[PDB]
Motif scaffolding. Structure first.
Motif, PDB file in Angstrom:
ATOM      1  N   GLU A 189       0.799  -1.220   0.000  1.00 24.24           N
ATOM      2  CA  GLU A 189       0.000   0.000   0.000  1.00 24.24           C
ATOM      3  C   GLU A 189       0.836   1.275   0.000  1.00 24.24           C
ATOM      4  O   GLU A 189       0.259   2.367   0.015  1.00 24.24           O
ATOM      5  CB  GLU A 189      -0.935   0.007   1.209  1.00 24.24           C
ATOM      6  N   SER A 190       2.162   1.172  -0.016  1.00 21.07           N
ATOM      7  CA  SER A 190       3.038   2.334  -0.050  1.00 21.07           C
ATOM      8  C   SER A 190       4.051   2.280  -1.185  1.00 21.07           C
ATOM      9  O   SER A 190       5.021   3.043  -1.164  1.00 21.07           O
ATOM     10  CB  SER A 190       3.768   2.483   1.288  1.00 21.07           C
ATOM     11  N   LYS A 202       6.137  -0.195  -2.039  1.00 23.69           N
ATOM     12  CA  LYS A 202       7.258  -1.108  -1.868  1.00 23.69           C
ATOM     13  C   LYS A 202       6.912  -2.486  -2.416  1.00 23.69           C
ATOM     14  O   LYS A 202       5.746  -2.886  -2.441  1.00 23.69           O
ATOM     15  CB  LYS A 202       7.643  -1.222  -0.395  1.00 23.69           C
ATOM     16  N   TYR A 247       6.901   5.574  -6.702  1.00 19.72           N
ATOM     17  CA  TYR A 247       8.028   5.198  -5.852  1.00 19.72           C
ATOM     18  C   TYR A 247       7.615   5.165  -4.386  1.00 19.72           C
ATOM     19  O   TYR A 247       7.844   4.174  -3.685  1.00 19.72           O
ATOM     20  CB  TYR A 247       9.185   6.177  -6.049  1.00 19.72           C
ATOM     21  N   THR A 248       7.010   6.248  -3.906  1.00 21.69           N
ATOM     22  CA  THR A 248       6.484   6.328  -2.553  1.00 21.69           C
ATOM     23  C   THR A 248       4.992   6.615  -2.619  1.00 21.69           C
ATOM     24  O   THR A 248       4.413   6.628  -3.706  1.00 21.69           O
ATOM     25  CB  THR A 248       7.209   7.416  -1.757  1.00 21.69           C
ATOM     26  N   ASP A 249       4.352   6.846  -1.475  1.00 26.32           N
ATOM     27  CA  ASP A 249       2.939   7.192  -1.453  1.00 26.32           C
ATOM     28  C   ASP A 249       2.714   8.691  -1.291  1.00 26.32           C
ATOM     29  O   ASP A 249       1.566   9.126  -1.150  1.00 26.32           O
ATOM     30  CB  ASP A 249       2.219   6.430  -0.341  1.00 26.32           C
ATOM     31  N   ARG A 250       3.781   9.488  -1.312  1.00 22.54           N
ATOM     32  CA  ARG A 250       3.699  10.932  -1.127  1.00 22.54           C
ATOM     33  C   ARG A 250       3.728  11.679  -2.455  1.00 22.54           C
ATOM     34  O   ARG A 250       4.394  12.709  -2.588  1.00 22.54           O
ATOM     35  CB  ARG A 250       4.815  11.416  -0.203  1.00 22.54           C
TER      36      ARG A 250
END
Lengths: 65, 116, 65, 155, 95
Positions: A26-27, A29, A61-64
């Motif tokens: 969910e992030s 990875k 890449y990330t959730d941000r």
RNA sequence: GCUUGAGUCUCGUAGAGGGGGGUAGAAUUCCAGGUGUAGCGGUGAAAUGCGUAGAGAUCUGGAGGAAUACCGGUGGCGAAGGCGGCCCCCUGGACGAAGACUGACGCUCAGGUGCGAAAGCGUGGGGAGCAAACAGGAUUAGAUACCCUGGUAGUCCACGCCGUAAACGAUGUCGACUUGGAGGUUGUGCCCUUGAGGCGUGGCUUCCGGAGCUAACGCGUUAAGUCGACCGCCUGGGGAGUACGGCCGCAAGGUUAAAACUCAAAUGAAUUGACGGGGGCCCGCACAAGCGGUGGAGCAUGUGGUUUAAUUCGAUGCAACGCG
């Protein structure tokens, strides 16, 4: 569990992003093969499909973001 | 002034100290309070209770802005980081989102040496 | 990581997602490149993981009670 | 101790009033094992409490005790290479016994002439909350509320 | 620090008494603050033996050393006590 | 001559093998601007340091360097050293299936030649973070250290030099032979791919154990078993991998390699204890929770010391000192 990629004779490509989003968490990875139960050969080329989809912005890449 | 309604409450969560600040949706700050300025100094700055007193001291002096709903950002492996948010929903706020925004390098700069 | 859940507020449902891989990572980037101790610790780990496999399989003989 | 949750034994009550709470109180100031000398001082100190407060005698005693009993007690706890004063909440059977011990140690100092009136002055001043017995309770709570930063329990 | 020198079959002189206190001035400041000392010197047909009982803020510590000519016995006794005083000191620092 | 060793070729397969070029995101730092106000940072505590000239926190934009989270695996590859994002170009080896081909072309090597972590060195760049040295603050009896705040070479790039490591599997290379079990990884054959099925067969690799071996610990088809080929090396401990000499190197130094003198040991593995500021578990007025004392006072008494013609002798940490 087992590997559905070894159940067929297909190739894990980066363009089939519908089947890759159940292989990341969910992030963003990559989920390890000790959880998913993928074969080690297909897990190595799965991450090469995750890393190419991250470059072409089909996966984050990330959730941000 | 500007009487903004929805905001963001960033929580800095270092080991030695916890800083909580409150901003709006646009990202420019309104007010802040730390655990070192709440009367706790030294060994008691690294306590989740000192992060609670830093929250209610920051929940006041934003009554001038009139916030009733806010998001929560936490950053750092602190002893607070969750006792701070319990001091905000008890203070009369609508917590829409709680988000972890701690900085993780995808292996970049070299950290210092392990102290012995 | 990102919880925007409705109803009754209780991070409770937040620490399920967050205490997953958000503190073990930041405590090991906390200091020291190591460059060779990872190796040592890593190799000590699995020599004690198969110590749990090859003893608990041999512990199912009896229990003296 | 290490073992032995101890088998607790009972106390015989006071003759003049049907209470073991005041019989626990007379046993505290009973110095060198002299109970008739102990009981004569406390009976002379609570009849003096009635005229100096107006109420009846025995319930004027605990209204001076709820104004002096504590709710939290701070302890020294050894953790790491140091030792800080963690606060803990008091059990009620210790709570009154910690209170009436604070009364007597304030009664042996605060030197007036006789022991019966030395106890009789601050049993009033415990109810008006300006005596030195209540200043022991408030300075215990002043140290426990300053040390609210130490505790894995929130009550 | 108060010295109490005592001899069993070794009548202490004046040069030996100051030799004890100058040596016990060493293991003084340099290792720990101490309360009270009892020094016992003994001769047992071969062994010039010297004991010492220090009293510190924590407890007590005792050491004994037999030597060659009653000067090397106290010189070995202080090195036995100084190591017990550093072990006791760091037991009470724990930083 | 022969094909079994060795090698060539035809198809494939896996791979952080190497060299060159590009590029992405996360994060640190700095710069600039907005908001905002008294703290930040640090520690077992604290101070140095930073901040009312507006820090820290927060948001936007920019600059630059280094490293590639998750995948990541007693996983893979390489002769070893070593090698992790992604993409392209050039390129090395290993391996398997089915054949075809040359026909002992092999194995191992003193000298020689090449490769060879990190630190260091030279010239030219680059320099975020980290960080010898150094500087300050602590701790301490002292602290020249551990801790803290800073911080320069160095770490990075190109081209050379150095040629050393607990460069380790403390195990040279090659070949043959000798019970098994559980796996990992990577090819492949057959049968019902009829189902992630079943049977096999190779390569590399991890663990546990049999015989045998070993001083024991252990090793155990990847031997330290049983043998053969060749090479390196050892000859009591210190002196000493040192001196001198030669060679090599810009330097640091490397390499080769003694003797005088000195000692009756040095050492390996295991055994029983003891100890540990190792781990687990348990008990005792051991601590805690309380009460009353001692140390301060005068006196009684004992001892040490001094004194004396003699102050009889013995008891001396706990376990001598109102003791014989």
């Amino acid at each position: 569990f087992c590997r559905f990629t070894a159940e067929g004779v297909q190739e894990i490509d980066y363009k089939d992003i519908a089947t890759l989003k159940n292989y990341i968490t969910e992030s963003g990875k990559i989920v390890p093969s000790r959880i998913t139960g993928t074969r080690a050969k297909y897990q190595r080329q799965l991450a090469r499909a995750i890393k190419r989809a991250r470059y072409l912005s089909l996966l984050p890449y990330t959730d941000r973001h | 002034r500007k009487q903004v309604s929805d905001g963001v409450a960033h929580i800095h969560a270092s080991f030695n100290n916890t800083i909580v600040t409150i901003t709006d949706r646009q990202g420019n700050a309104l007010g802040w309070a730390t655990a070192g300025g709440s009367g706790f100094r030294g060994s008691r700055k690294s306590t989740p209770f000192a992060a609670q007193v830093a929250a209610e001291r920051c929940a006041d002096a934003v009554k001038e802005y009139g916030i009733k709903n806010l998001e929560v950002m936490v950053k750092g492996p602190g002893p607070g980081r969750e006792s701070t948010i319990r001091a905000l929903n008890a203070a009369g706020f609508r917590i829409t989102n709680i988000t972890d925004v701690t900085p993780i390098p995808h292996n970049g700069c070299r950290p210092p040496k392990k102290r012995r | 990581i990102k919880v925007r859940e409705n109803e009754p507020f209780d991070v409770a449902l937040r620490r399920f997602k967050r205490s997953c891989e958000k503190a073990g990572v930041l405590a090991e980037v906390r200091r020291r490149e190591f460059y060779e101790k990872p190796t040592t610790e890593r190799k000590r780990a699995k020599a004690s993981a198969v110590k749990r496999h090859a003893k608990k399989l041999a512990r199912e003989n009896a229990r003296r009670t | 101790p290490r073992r032995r949750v101890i088998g607790q034994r009972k106390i015989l009550p006071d003759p003049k009033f049907g209470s073991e709470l005041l019989a626990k109180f007379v046993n505290i100031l009973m110095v060198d094992g002299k109970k008739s000398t102990a009981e004569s001082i406390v009976y002379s100190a609570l009849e003096t409490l009635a005229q100096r407060s107006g109420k009846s005698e025995l319930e004027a005693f605990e209204v001076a005790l709820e104004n002096v009993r504590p709710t939290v007690e701070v302890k020294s706890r050894r953790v790491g290479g140091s030792t800080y004063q963690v606060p803990v909440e008091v059990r009620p059977v210790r709570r009154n016994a910690l209170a009436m011990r604070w009364i007597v140690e304030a009664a042996r100092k605060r030197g007036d002439k006789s022991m019966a009136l030395r106890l009789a002055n601050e049993l009033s001043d415990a109810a008006e909350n300006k005596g030195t017995a209540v200043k022991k309770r408030e300075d215990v709570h002043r140290m426990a509320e300053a040390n609210k930063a130490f505790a894995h329990y929130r009550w | 620090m108060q010295l109490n020198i005592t001899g069993n079959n070794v009548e202490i002189t004046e040069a030996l008494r100051e030799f004890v206190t100058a040596k016990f001035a060493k293991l003084e400041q340099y290792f720990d603050r101490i309360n009270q000392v009892y020094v016992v010197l003994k001769v047992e047909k071969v062994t010039h033996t010297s004991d010492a009982t220090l009293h510190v803020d924590g407890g007590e510590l005792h050491a004994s050393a037999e030597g060659q000519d009653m000067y090397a016995a106290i010189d070995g006794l202080i090195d036995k006590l100084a190591r017990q005083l550093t072990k006791h000191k760091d037991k009470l620092k724990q930083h």
